Amino acid sequence: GGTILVVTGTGTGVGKTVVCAALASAARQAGIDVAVCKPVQTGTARGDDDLAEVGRLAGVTQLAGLARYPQPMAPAAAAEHAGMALPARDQIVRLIADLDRPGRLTLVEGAGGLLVELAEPGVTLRDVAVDVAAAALVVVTADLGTLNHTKLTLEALAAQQVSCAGLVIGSWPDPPGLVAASNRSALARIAMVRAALPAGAASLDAGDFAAMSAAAFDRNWVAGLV
Amino acid sequence: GGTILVVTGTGTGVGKTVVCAALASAARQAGIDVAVCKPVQTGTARGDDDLAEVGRLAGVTQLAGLARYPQPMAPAAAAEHAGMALPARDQIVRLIADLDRPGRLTLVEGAGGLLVELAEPGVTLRDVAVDVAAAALVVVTADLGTLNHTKLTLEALAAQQVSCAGLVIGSWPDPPGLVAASNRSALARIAMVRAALPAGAASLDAGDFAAMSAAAFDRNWVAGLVG
Numbered sequence: 427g428g429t430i431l432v433v434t435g436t437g438t439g440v441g442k443t444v445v446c447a448a449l450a451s452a453a454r455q456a457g458i459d460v461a462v463c464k465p466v467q468t469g470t471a472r473g474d475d476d477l478a479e480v481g482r483l484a485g486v487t488q489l490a491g492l493a494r495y496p497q498p499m500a501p502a503a504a505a506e507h508a509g510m511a512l513p514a515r516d517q518i519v520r521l522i523a524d525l526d527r528p529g530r531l532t533l534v535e536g537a538g539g540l541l542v543e544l545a546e547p548g549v550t551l552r553d554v555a556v557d558v559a560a561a562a563l564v565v566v567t568a569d570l571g572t573l574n575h576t577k578l579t580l581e582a583l584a585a586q587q588v589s590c591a592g593l594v595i596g597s598w599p600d601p602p603g604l605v606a607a608s609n610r611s612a613l614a615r616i617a618m619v620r621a622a623l624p625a626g627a628a629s630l631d632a633g634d635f636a637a638m639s640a641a642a643f644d645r646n647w648v649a650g651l652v
Numbered sequence: 653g654g655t656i657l658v659v660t661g662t663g664t665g666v667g668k669t670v671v672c673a674a675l676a677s678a679a680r681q682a683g684i685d686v687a688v689c690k691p692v693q694t695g696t697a698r699g700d701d702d703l704a705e706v707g708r709l710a711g712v713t714q715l716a717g718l719a720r721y722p723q724p725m726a727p728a729a730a731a732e733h734a735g736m737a738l739p740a741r742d743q744i745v746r747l748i749a750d751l752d753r754p755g756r757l758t759l760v761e762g763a764g765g766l767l768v769e770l771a772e773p774g775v776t777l778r779d780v781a782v783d784v785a786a787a788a789l790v791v792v793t794a795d796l797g798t799l800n801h802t803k804l805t806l807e808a809l810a811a812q813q814v815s816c817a818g819l820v821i822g823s824w825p826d827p828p829g830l831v832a833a834s835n836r837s838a839l840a841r842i843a844m845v846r847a848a849l850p851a852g853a854a855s856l857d858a859g860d861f862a863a864m865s866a867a868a869f870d871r872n873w874v875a876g877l878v879g
């Protein structure tokens with residue numbers, strides 16, 4: 427196999443997808459073959475499609491999903507609303523395992539934070555990460571409260587021996603501000619901050635997004651991922 | 653001693669203080685002697701004073717502070733900004749132990765969420781709860797994202813064998829939307845939802861607050877907290 431990395435976050439709406447896209451873009455620009463697996467998508471009624479964001483922003487074509495739920499809710503609630511079960515754990519893990527190949531960086535995107543249910547019954551992205559021996563990249567905010575949520579997520583990773591590949595600040599403000607600047611220094615004291623994406627990066631066109639991504643990450647770190 | 657409960661939250665601004673006030677009020681209405689302590693208060697330059705707020709709302713008079721910092725930031729950053737040190741672990745323990753008394757419910761209000769550093773080095777409200785054998789009451793929101801934060805918080809309590817006294821929804825919308833109702837149902841499957849404080853509870857006067865508080869908690873559960 428290659429390198430499997432779950433891209434999780436401290437919560438919902440913290441920039442997981444755009445960080446997934448940004449890392450994919452940087453990796454592809456380093457010559458790395460990149461696949462993204464998002465087993466479960468919700469909020470499809472309003473048009474959510476994080477795989478398409480990755481495909482458009484980063485140029486990834488190996489974009490694997492299993493289930494799509496109309497309502498913009500956590501997978502379990504969206505599945506309950508729709509009256510249909512979430513996928514099975516085996517579906518998700520085998521899909522990722524089949525995507526994984528030598529020389530490839532396979533990013534795995536869940537929904538919401540680390541402990542949200544992704545597959546029936548009650549299996550999370552952390553469970554999946556354990557099953558496929560992935561490390562976890564954790565997308566954080568720079569906002570008030572990020573320190574607790576980041577420490578909570580890192581503890582939960584370590585509790586099941588899922589290695590933390592670093593943090594990415596999903597949206598970095600301009601100009602920072604006292605709290606954002608303080609949080610960035612504090613976050614760097616608990617884990618490597620791999621990048622801090624400029625606020626609004628998710629709306630860029632493909633060209634600007636690739637330039638942003640290459641600048642966002644350390645070249646050597648990206649190159650060493652596989 | 654009596655019963656020590658730390659009142660924590662999934663994060664900042666989730667209603668910890670109002671919940672502390674609400675529980676204090678319900679317990680006082682049960683005849684339970686209540687003390688509330690706030691090891692670390694930040695935001696004094698903004699006028700933040702959670703003890704004064706619990707006193708105003710619930711009529712608690714036994715209010716013990718320790719460290720206070722001007723800036724409305726996490727304790728470590730507020731202390732750093734003030735050129736001050738955080739308190740030491742033994743100072744928070746002493747502050748709580750001095751309050752603990754048979755038949756008394758002592759509430760310890762944290763700053764931000766459970767894993768926030770309250771004492772150097774990296775000492776948290778969870779560490780303090782371990783030191784004083786306190787259970788933890790977890791204030792949650794009903795908003796999108798609460799489920800992950802609540803499970804993260806409950807796992808962190810269990811990782812150190814800190815009993816979870818239950819959850820309190822810090823603000824409950826009336827009427828609830830689809831997500832809030834789904835979240836409350838999902839929260840109750842995670843742990844006991846002891847109360848859901850009505851939105852705007854913090855704005856009530858002492859009489860309406862006391863009524864809301866007596867209505868918000870199960871009086872048997874409250875009385876059961878303290879022997």
Ligand SMILES: O=C(O)C[C@@H]1CCC[C@H]1Cc1ccc(C(=O)O)cc1
Pocket residue numbers: 437438439440442468469474497498499500501536537538539542795796797798799800801
């Ligand atoms: O991936 C995202 O964060 C954006 C999704 C868009 C639709 C709802 C988001 C999924 C989600 C929301 C709340 C919770 C919870 O833990 O309460 C778990 C997962």
Ligand SMILES: O=C(O)C[C@@H]1CCC[C@H]1Cc1ccc(C(=O)O)cc1
Pocket residue numbers: 569570571572573574575663664665666668694695700723724725726727762763764765768
């Ligand atoms: O008690 C509260 O939640 C209200 C305080 C008012 C001013 C800052 C709040 C404290 C705090 C903020 C962020 C974090 C973090 O983990 O980033 C930890 C603690």
